[PDB]
């Protein structure tokens, strides 16, 4: 595709994005206060494991 100068001219101008923060807060609340807690431990353990994996990957890519 292509990108036009009007795209940037409308990106700089505000588009009225002061209303979705309410539903963002509501979804954060629905994810924390009432969502199940058992899978949170599993997903954060997986996140830590993938962080370790990518750290090892970059460490082994540094030498090469």
């Amino acid at each position: 595709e292509e990108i036009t100068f009007e795209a940037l001219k409308k990106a700089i101008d505000t588009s009225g994005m002061e209303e979705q923060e309410k539903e963002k807060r509501r979804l954060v609340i629905e994810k924390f206060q009432k969502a199940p807690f058992e899978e949170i431990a599993a997903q954060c353990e997986s996140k830590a494991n993938l962080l370790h994996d990518r750290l090892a990957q970059i460490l082994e890519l540094t030498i090469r």
């Binding site: 990108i3 700089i12 540094t62 030498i63």
Partner: protein, 435 residues
């Protein structure tokens, strides 16, 4: 009513004598403390009424019979009663004869009011946990900080008046006492004001107390350190020089002076002089001095105008960096800066090894990842550099230089569409981060 005051004075003295006698014989202690409280109240009435009569000199029993009761409370642990007694003492009408007692009680209240309670254990003076100043236009205290700051302000305002002006003709006791009082009150003020982060007011207050300072290291050092936090530079540099003159034994002061010289003020000769002074005098301080001297030499190299002195400054800087690294092998900043300086001479493998060692020391540095990514550009390995830039952006999704490097690298490897996408993302980020 219509009672001569000397009768109140003598009955208060009798109350104090009985209270002294009541305890010295084998509950009733509460009655004795109540007698002390009523003696203090009648003494306050006596002093206020005698002052009123005089306006139309030996305070001996009020202070004892009142303070020592809540001193016994402190020995027992009745903090609330003592706080209430102090509040009712301070809220009373001022007395010119007991201004020193007002000073003392205010200082005692301020000393304990910052290190003896919590936020939820605070109450306004107008509710429970002779003439009294009142009205609706007065400033009602709200929190501990407000009233503590007000008490410190009034104590400082009155304590400046009673200064002996550091007379030192032949006697020194009075000046020493005044200096100790000023030091403690200003220390309380600065410790109270530091926790909230209003440094301009603190700097102004410290500057207000510079009349007493003639040959004092502490006040000058405190003022100099307070000046730097606010943002002012030239006055900070001058006071740092004066402090260096005062006591030439430490190394932190010239290091801070050199840092300020190297910073936004953009001066060079003074930084070199301070670095040489530091290196003239454990091992960490001299390593830091060597690093600062090398940084100054490297900075002078960029702003040159001819050929030879550039190489001379570069070789001096690399020698200084090598010496600093040799003197201390357990700091990643020195290794990173040595790798950065070495890369200027286009010697690639040695700089790569040094930056690898620096990453081994610390693998989360922002600038180290950028340097590693930029090093691969000279070796013509574009995808790996792109991946490193991607990892760095994952760490810092709010930086600017890394994304500029990302745009530059994308424009050379994949195509312009990704560059346009990154540019519009950066525009959106800039709009989000500002108003």
């Amino acid at each position: 009513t219509a009672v001569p005051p000397y009768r109140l004075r003598v009955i208060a003295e009798a109350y104090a004598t009985k209270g002294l006698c009541l305890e010295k014989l084998p509950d009733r202690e509460q009655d004795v403390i109540t007698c002390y409280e009523k003696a203090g109240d009648i003494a306050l009435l006596y002093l206020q009424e005698i002052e009123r009569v005089i306006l139309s000199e030996l305070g001996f029993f009020l202070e004892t019979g009142l303070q020592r009761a809540h001193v016994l409370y402190f020995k027992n642990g009745n903090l609330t009663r003592g706080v209430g007694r102090f509040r009712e003492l301070l809220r009373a009408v001022e007395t010119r004869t007991t201004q020193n007692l007002r000073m003392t009680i205010a200082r005692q209240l301020a000393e304990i009011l910052l290190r003896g309670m919590c936020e939820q254990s605070y109450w306004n003076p107008l509710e429970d946990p002779a003439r009294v100043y009142s009205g609706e236009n007065i400033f009602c205290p709200q929190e501990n900080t407000e009233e503590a700051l007000l008490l410190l302000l009034i104590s400082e305002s009155m304590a400046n008046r009673d200064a002996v002006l550091s007379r030192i003709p032949e006697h020194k006791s009075d000046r020493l006492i005044s200096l100790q009082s000023a030091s403690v009150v200003y220390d309380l003020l600065t410790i109270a004001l530091g926790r909230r982060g209003q440094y301009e007011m603190l700097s102004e207050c410290l500057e207000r107390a510079m009349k007493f300072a003639f040959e004092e290291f502490h006040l000058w050092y405190q003022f100099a350190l307070s000046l730097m936090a606010a943002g002012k530079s030239a006055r900070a540099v001058k006071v740092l020089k004066e402090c260096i003159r005062l006591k030439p034994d430490d190394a932190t002061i010239p290091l801070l002076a050199a840092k300020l010289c190297m910073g936004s003020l953009h001066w060079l000769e003074e930084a070199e002089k301070f670095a040489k002074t530091v290196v003239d005098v454990t091992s960490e301080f001299k390593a830091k001095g060597y690093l600062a001297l090398g940084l100054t030499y490297s900075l002078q190299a960029t702003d040159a105008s001819l050929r030879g002195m550039q190489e001379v400054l570069q070789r001096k800087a690399l020698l200084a960096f090598q010496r600093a690294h040799s003197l201390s092998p357990t700091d990643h900043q020195a290794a990173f800066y040595l790798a950065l300086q070495l890369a200027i001479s286009r010697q690639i493998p040695e700089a790569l090894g040094y930056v690898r060692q620096a990453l081994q020391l610390q693998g989360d540095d922002a600038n180290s990842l950028h340097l590693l990514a930029l090093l691969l550009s000279a070796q013509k390995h574009y995808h790996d550099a792109l991946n490193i830039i991607d990892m760095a952006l994952s760490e810092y999704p709010e930086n600017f230089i890394l994304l500029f490097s990302k745009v530059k690298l994308q424009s050379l490897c994949r195509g312009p569409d990704e560059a346009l996408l990154t540019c519009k993302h950066m525009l959106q980020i800039w709009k989000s981060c500002y108003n």
